[PDB]
C-alpha cells in the first residue's frame, strides 16, 4: 500500500492515515509535502512481542526531500499506532491493522 507523507495541499497528515493490510504486505511511505517527515511506531501501541526498532525509523532520522521513501512489511496480526515525531502534536498520526 502507498501512504503519502503530507497531503497535496501541504497538510501534515498520512494519506491514508487508517488502513488494513495482510501479513507480509509492504507499506511504502512516500515523502510528499510538508517535510521533514519520519515514521515511528509506538512501542506501547503495537502487538505484544514485536520489536518497534525493526519496523520504525529512529526518532532522529528524517526524510527531507520529495520522493524519499520508507518501506516496511508487518507480519504479526493486530493494531499498530504510528506517528511522525516532529509533527506528532500537529496530529500527524496513523494506525494500521494487520488482519
Ligand atoms: Hg511529519
From Swiss-Prot:
Cu cation binds at residues 37, 84, 87, 92. The crystal structure with reduced Cu(1+) has also been determined. GO terms for molecular function: copper ion binding; electron transporter, transferring electrons from cytochrome b6/f complex of photosystem II activity. It is a peripheral membrane protein. Residues 1-99 form the Plastocyanin-like domain. Its cofactor is Cu(2+). It is found in: Plastid, Chloroplast thylakoid membrane. Keywords: Chloroplast, Copper, Electron transport, Membrane, Metal-binding, Plastid, Thylakoid, Transit peptide, Transport. It comes from the Eukaryota. One of its GO terms (cellular component) is chloroplast thylakoid lumen. Belongs to the plastocyanin family. Participates in electron transfer between P700 and the cytochrome b6-f complex in photosystem I. This is Plastocyanin A, chloroplastic. It comes from Populus nigra. The gene is PETE. The chain holds residues 70 to 168 of 168 of the full protein.
Amino acid at each position: 500500500i502507498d501512504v503519502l507523507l503530507g497531503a497535496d495541499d501541504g497538510s501534515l497528515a498520512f494519506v491514508p492515515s487508517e488502513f488494513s493490510i495482510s501479513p507480509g504486505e509492504k507499506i511504502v511511505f512516500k515523502n510528499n509535502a510538508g517535510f521533514p517527515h519520519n515514521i515511528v511506531f509506538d512501542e506501547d501501541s503495537i502487538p505484544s512481542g514485536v520489536d518497534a526498532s525493526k519496523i520504525s525509523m529512529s526518532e532522529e532520522d528524517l526524510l527531507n526531500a520529495k520522493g524519499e521513501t520508507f518501506e516496511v512489511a508487518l507480519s504479526n496480526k493486530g493494531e499498530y499506532s504510528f506517528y511522525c515525531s516532529p509533527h506528532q502534536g500537529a496530529g500527524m498520526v496513523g494506525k494500521v491493522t494487520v488482519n
